Design a protein around this nucleic acid. Structure first.
Lengths: 115, 128, 131, 148, 102, 50
RNA sequence: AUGCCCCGAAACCCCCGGGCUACACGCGCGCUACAAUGGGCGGGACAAUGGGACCCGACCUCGAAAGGGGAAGGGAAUCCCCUAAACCCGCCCUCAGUUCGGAUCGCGGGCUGCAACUCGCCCGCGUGAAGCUGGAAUCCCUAGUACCCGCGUGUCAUCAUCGCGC
RNA sequence: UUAAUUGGAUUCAACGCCGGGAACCUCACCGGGGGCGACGGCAGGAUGAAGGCCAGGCUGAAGGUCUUGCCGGACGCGCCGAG
């Protein structure tokens, strides 16, 4: 089973947003207390309609700063890395983290012959 | 009698009157000042003045600005000026002059302004 | 006692107890000082006179620091990820905790996990010349 | 003789050992588990470190008169090492001296002048000058020159 | 008794001296106690800027300055005396601020 | 859509009065001048060298 | 500013994101040290320059701190930043990559911005290494100067180990 | 190396320099999106908007785009000269 601060994903489901954020670190909890962006709120409307089935579009996003909550778990969202929308599928273990962490934007650098 | 002493930035105002011998720095007794080297600088002039002049007059000196060495030097300056004015004797004047010219002249040395090319380190320091 | 074993880790008796406890990983000088104060003992005494009941007292302090008077903010992992509880980890538990955090950052495919995979600096250090 | 006529450290030690007696001064439950300042790196060594602070604080009140918390924080602050970065000065924490001062207010040695800080009551002045007179009387025998 | 306080601030020294002298000459003509002009500290605005418009070459700096002077004139309460001061011709670079302290 | 977003802070907030550059602007008591722009107007402002 | 050429749904303008930080690496200038004149607890005397109204904010209160709340007074000789560090004394540890050395990484909390994962700072705890005196070679300086010590300020909502100045 | 790490600077006189602080802005790089192009001529006009607008889909989102149909009550598509 998956546990977050001594609670499971379904246990995390029923917690209010304030109590839920109390489990988050200071950065994420304070970001939530300061209020999501209006664009973040539009994305929340999108993902919530998707989880109810009404929203059937392959869901994209630019909000790299959108902090993953337990309610995003189990959905595929495509975050803009700067050039395209890299896809990510939300496992339960990303509770307490930002979207941009899992949207790579810099490619791998390897070393060849010096000029 | 009033006297003045300037050292770098520190300024010491000294007042001398007839008294037992109590000497105070900022209202503090002379023998208790923690930096011993500064205690010796402050004690330097009246050593050569003599215990009679020491025990014939009371002195209060109040110093502001500069550091503790500068403050002690300013008090040393003001003490000598106060003594030579109170007694009005040239013998001890030449005694101090012989021991140290700055005793009654003083050091007009001042810090030069810092200049560019890594100004933080001084007027003359530069980069490598 | 020139040798004193506490919580499965040996310490020199010549060092003072606040200095002796430092040899254990998971304990710094400040942690040693506060646990010594919890014991109500002098921080400066030689560890080589540690009669065993004090060893057990320090041990059960390690087991649950919070209930012994230590606040919630002197532990190494406050609000533990799988219990919600502020716990002071030690030795193999600490290694397993950091290891699990590493594989968690890797599994989520975060940038921190990527750096731990490639053995690169995490916190934005400039590496064009450095490292 | 007043506090001015004796060294600061000896008078502070004497005031600390004397104030150990008064029950009004008691370390709070968080005192042993907090270091005296952010600038400090290692926790206080002696378990008496509380009382010397109080003995120190009252002495400042004997000299600086109306003083607030922040001025004492600047005074008790110190230099802190910033790792590879150079050191820098920082003010001391507020809670420790705040508790010490509020206990002193409870002890009645100090009073509050609102908008200006806390000052020293006549009782504290008598206590301090009594201690200073005893210390100076001793040092007069050790050092005759203080009889002057 | 009521006292009128006049602050005179100006970059130009000579204009400040002229206005102060004008007030002084008005004073004893009106026969009212007028405390002499106290010259407060002169404020020194300093700005240091790199000379080079581009970044190439040696690093050189230019230090530009303003010295703004300020004098304080306290005078006593006589409506005739304080009537004769709006009639003063004041140069542009000199600024006068007059307040009334009990 | 063509309106720049209102930036109270950052380099974008302040622009030179004279040349409008977003780079070095001196704000000592309200100049708002580009460092290049300062040198040609300092004498006009009354600045002297010493 | 401005010659010539070119660009005209762009090389014009506006919005989002990334990037400008990426690194096996070499080089430049600095920062911290490579511990005994060392490290640490307590205490004391000590400055100057400048800046201060979406500001300084004394003073009071809560919090261990980061900080939160209230808050007089200040548009400046009058209120605030404001007090220093290097210094010494009393005592503790006692030449060892170790106590120094902290890079590094985890957790929690605080702060600015609408937003710091890329890509901020600060705080408490834990880990905390390399580093134990540097060849060839070359750098600066001659008196309140060099070194050492910290501070103020420019850019600055936050960012310094930077520049200018004390 | 990178889609991109925007460019200048080469010993004395380039390398805490322009950058005198890059999360946006700075911005000049890259990817994606959106709006235009003064003023004249050709043609149109007003028969009505050129611009915004609900419900959506695309759109990261933005009546941007289109389904739908309104306003808006006023002259501006497209091509050429030229901006």
């Amino acid at each position: 089973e998956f546990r977050y601060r001594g609670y499971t994903l379904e246990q995390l489901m029923n917690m209010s947003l304030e109590e839920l954020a109390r489990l988050f670190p200071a950065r994420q909890r304070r970001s939530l207390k300061r209020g999501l962006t209006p664009e973040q709120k539009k994305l929340l409307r999108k993902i919530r309609l998707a989880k109810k089935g009404k929203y059937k579009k392959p869901i994209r996003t630019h909000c790299r700063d959108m902090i993953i909550l337990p309610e995003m778990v189990g959905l595929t969202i495509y975050v803009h890395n700067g050039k395209e929308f890299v896809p990510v599928e939300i496992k339960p273990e990303m509770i307490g983290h930002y979207l941009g962490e899992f949207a790579p934007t810099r490619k791998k650098v390897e070393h060849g012959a010096p000029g | 009698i009033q006297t003045t002493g300037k050292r770098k930035t520190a300024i010491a105002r000294a007042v001398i009157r007839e008294g037992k011998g109590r000497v105070r720095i900022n209202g503090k007794p002379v023998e208790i000042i923690e930096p011993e080297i500064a205690r010796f600088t402050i004690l330097e002039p009246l050593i050569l003045a003599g215990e009679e002049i020491w025990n014939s007059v009371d002195i209060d000196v109040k110093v502001e600005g500069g550091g503790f060495m500068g403050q002690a030097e300013a008090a040393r300056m003001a003490i000598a000026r106060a003594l030579v004015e109170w007694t009005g004797d040239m013998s001890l004047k030449e005694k101090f002059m012989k021991y140290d010219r700055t005793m009654l002249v003083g050091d007009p040395r001042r810090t030069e302004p810092h200049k560019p090319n890594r100004s933080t380190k001084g007027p003359r320091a530069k980069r490598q | 006692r020139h040798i004193v074993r506490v919580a499965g880790v040996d310490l020199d008796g010549n060092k003072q107890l606040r200095w002796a406890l430092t040899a254990i990983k998971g304990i710094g000088i400040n942690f040693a000082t506060m646990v010594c104060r919890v014991a109500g003992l002098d921080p400066f005494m030689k560890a080589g006179y540690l009669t065993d009941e004090q060893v057990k007292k320090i041990e059960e302090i390690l087991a649950d620091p919070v209930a012994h008077g230590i606040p919630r903010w002197a532990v190494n992992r406050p609000k533990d990820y799988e219990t919600g509880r502020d716990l002071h980890l030690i030795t193999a538990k600490l290694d397993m905790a950091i290891r699990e955090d590493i594989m968690r950052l890797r599994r989520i495919r975060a940038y921190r996990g990527i750096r731990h995979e490639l053995g690169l600096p995490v916190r934005g250090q400039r590496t064009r010349s450095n490292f | 003789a007043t506090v001015y006529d004796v060294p600061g450290d000896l008078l502070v030690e004497r005031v600390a050992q004397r104030l150990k007696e008064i029950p009004e001064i008691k370390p709070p439950e968080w005192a042993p588990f907090v270091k005296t300042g952010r600038h400090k790196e290692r926790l206080p060594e002696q378990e008496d470190w509380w009382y010397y602070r109080v003995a120190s604080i009252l002495r400042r009140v004997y000299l600086d008169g109306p003083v607030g918390i922040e001025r004492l924080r600047t005074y008790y602050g110190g230099r802190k090492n910033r790792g590879h970065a150079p050191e820098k000065f920082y003010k001391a924490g507020g809670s420790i001296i705040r508790k010490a001062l509020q206990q002193l207010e409870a002890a009645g040695f100090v009073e509050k002048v609102p908008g200006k800080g806390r000052v020293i009551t006549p009782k504290g002045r008598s206590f301090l000058d009594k201690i200073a007179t005893e210390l100076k009387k001793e040092l007069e025998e050790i050092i005759p020159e203080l009889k002057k | 008794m009521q006292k009128a306080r006049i602050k005179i601030a100006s970059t130009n020294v000579r204009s400040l001296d002229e206005v102060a002298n004008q007030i002084k000459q008005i004073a004893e003509r009106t026969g009212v106690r007028m405390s002499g002009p106290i010259p407060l500290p002169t404020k020194r605005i300093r700005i240091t800027t790199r000379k080079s418009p581009d970044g190439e070459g040696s690093a050189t700096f230019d230090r530009w300055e303003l010295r703004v002077h300020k004098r304080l004139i306290d005078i006593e309460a006589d409506e005739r005396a304080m009537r004769q001061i709006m009639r003063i011709r004041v140069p542009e670079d000199v600024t006068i601020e007059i307040e009334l302290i009990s | 859509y063509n309106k720049r977003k209102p930036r109270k802070f950052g380099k974008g907030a302040r622009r030179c009065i004279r040349c409008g550059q977003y780079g070095p602007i001196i704000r000592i008591q309200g100049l708002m001048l580009c460092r290049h722009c300062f040198r040609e107007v300092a004498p006009k402002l009354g600045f002297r060298k010493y």
